[PDB]
Amino acid sequence: SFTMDFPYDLNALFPERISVLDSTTVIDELGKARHHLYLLKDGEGRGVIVGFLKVGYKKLFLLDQRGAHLETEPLCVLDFYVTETLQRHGYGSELFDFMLKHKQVEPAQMAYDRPSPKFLSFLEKRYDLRNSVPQVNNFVVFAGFFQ
């Protein structure tokens, strides 16, 4: 058994629509705002869930470095969040490094679904992913993806 608290924001942006019922009333609604989801908690001292990371495979139609079309099905980062007040504490790096270690895969080999400015900075500074191959499908892949 274990305890689980969701900050307001992480609770709403949860990448899974979940209704929790009590034998019949509802305890919590998450998500109002081939796959693997990673969650992370901290003793603080009364516990709390601080981040989540969802990755999964997805068939993608991409352009290569010279515009040639091509299909591929890489592991993709689909959702990635750390409750706001606790960003830049290292939690993001924790979740991400675990995922890589166990999925046994490198950042440059992944596609990134609609990364935000914070996530881009995170990828660029922490994993030196800087050179992106332009897409038109809202996924971001870097040069290593094709090498």
Ligand SMILES: CC(=O)SCCNC(=O)CCNC(=O)[C@H](O)C(C)(C)COP(=O)(O)OP(=O)(O)OC[C@H]1O[C@@H](n2cnc3c(N)ncnc32)[C@H](O)[C@@H]1OP(=O)(O)O
């Ligand atoms: C595919 C999808 O999931 S789309 C992307 C999702 N992004 C969002 O929803 C917005 C923000 N939410 C977040 O949870 C975080 O900002 C994440 C997921 C990007 C990173 O998690 P954090 O725990 O905050 O990152 P962590 O503390 O592990 O590493 C720090 C690095 O992240 C980046 N970072 C985190 N917050 C910021 C910020 N406000 N401005 C700029 N860079 C930031 C920087 O590269 C920073 O490096 P520095 O501290 O050396 O400058």
